[PDB]
């Protein structure tokens, strides 16, 4: 069975359930936007993201001598219904490609179960949802109803290639780092991809290569989904914790520091830059956070609202955090179970492992240099499929990653900008 049971068309009439006009909790004003619920707890908004951050509502590019090297602007991208239809279909197709692998099925299952914790109440004797982990859906009668959700895929903001995982913060709680979790908004586009070089010495050099091979967009989305997994379970590493790259002369002369959260997400050898001691520090830190959630759950006596029963919610979080329950019914965190879950989310779900499952060529490290951005169209089956990506079986593109070779499969890629030599 498919991850997305319905093949939505952007123009399909709204129904107030899985096709509806919605508003997000940006703590500001906005006109409702058309959205599609593609799976339990997951929505797609085919719009440029001018909502999550009020200071980023301008899609227009600054003057030429003001733009960052690695960036791409086009204020008109994703403004027409045809584009939105293709965006919806492209994102859906990538979710299917990801779900078709055992690793992808595992990651998506973890994401759906990762409901943001109900820790919004001010009194420890009752559990209450945090409204910023919900969206407001316009019902058939014109009224709004609050719906909890775990993930939203939305178009990029001004800089089209700056894909990232975003979420609304709390006045006092660090939701992505206190075990609670929060609704994740992933800025992403299936309509562009990036080039990389097949030789490591070239890919990690800022002056060489034009970007001969194209990254499979399913890997790019998986990368953001991995971050979402960490953030939904509240175990993301503080961005202030970074690796002062000293293994790349070019990075060094720029004094560039890369966050541990990114190295962990890529996995492979990159993850090894995080030493054992710091690794243990974080593990214990989050163990203590899961413990506090257990203590808060015990002090809870009632539930706020009538959408679900306390028994239901207390159990939903017992399954999310895989807690244990004694005779009296008190909750506790088990070391073996915590370590297993923590390891699954941080070591099993990595970019490097997804590359193995998709059988594609990909950058070998996160510590490299971008080469170029290409326009693509993965919707037509003659171009890309759920099962083979660009490397179509029984064609000349089947072997040696020929489908990702932009020189061989040139009809599937239009280079929009070169980054090499501009750093």
């Amino acid at each position: 069975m498919p991850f997305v049971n319905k093949q939505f068309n952007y123009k399909d009439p709204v129904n107030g359930v899985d096709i509806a006009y919605i508003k997000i909790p940006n703590a500001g004003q906005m006109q409702p936007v058309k959205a599609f619920k593609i799976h339990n707890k997951i929505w797609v908004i085919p719009e440029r993201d001018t909502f999550t951050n009020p200071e980023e509502g301008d899609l227009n590019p600054p003057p030429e001598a003001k733009q960052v090297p690695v960036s791409y602007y086009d204020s008109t991208y994703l403004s027409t219904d045809n584009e939105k239809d293709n965006y919806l279909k492209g994102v859906t197709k990538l979710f299917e490609r990801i779900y078709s692998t055992d690793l992808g099925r595992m990651l998506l299952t973890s994401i759906v179960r990762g409901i943001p914790f109900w820790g919004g109440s001010t009194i420890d004797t009752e559990l209450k949802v945090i409204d910023t982990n919900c969206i407001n859906v316009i019902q058939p009668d014109g009224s709004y109803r609050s719906e909890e959700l775990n993930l939203v895929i939305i178009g990029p903001s001004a800089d089209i290639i700056q894909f990232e995982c975003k979420s609304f913060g709390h006045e006092v709680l660090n939701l992505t780092r206190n075990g609670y979790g929060s609704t994740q908004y992933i800025r992403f586009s299936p309509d562009f991809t990036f080039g990389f070089e097949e030789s490591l010495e070239v890919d990690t050099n800022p002056l060489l290569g034009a970007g001969k091979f194209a990254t499979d967009p399913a890997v790019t989305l998986a990368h953001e989904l991995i971050h979402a997994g960490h953030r939904l379970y509240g175990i993301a590493i503080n961005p202030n914790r970074v690796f002062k790259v000293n293994t790349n002369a070019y990075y060094e002369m720029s004094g560039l520091e890369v966050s541990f959260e990114e190295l962990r997400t890529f996995g492979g050898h990159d993850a090894k830059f995080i030493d054992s001691l710091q690794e243990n520090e974080f593990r214990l830190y989050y163990y203590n956070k899961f413990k506090d959630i257990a203590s808060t759950l015990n002090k809870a006596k009632s539930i706020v609202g009538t959408t679900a029963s306390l028994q239901y919610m207390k159990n939903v979080f017992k399954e999310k955090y895989l807690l244990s329950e004694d005779t009296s019914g008190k909750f506790s965190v088990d070391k073996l179970k915590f370590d297993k879950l923590y390891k699954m989310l941080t070591e099993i779900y990595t970019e490097d492992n997804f590359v193995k499952f998709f059988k594609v060529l990909n950058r070998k490290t996160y510590l490299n240099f971008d080469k170029a951005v290409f326009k693509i169209n993965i919707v037509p089956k003659v171009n890309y499929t759920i099962y083979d990506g660009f490397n179509l079986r029984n064609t000349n593109l089947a072997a040696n990653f020929n489908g990702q070779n932009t020189e061989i499969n040139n009809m599937n890629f239009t280079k929009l900008k070169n980054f090499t030599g501009l750093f």
């Binding site: 090297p69 290639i161 894909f163 790019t220 953001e224 990114e262 971008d370 750093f423």
Partner: peptide, 6 residues
Amino acid sequence: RRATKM
């Protein structure tokens, strides 16, 4: 995040 500033 897709990549560093590089």
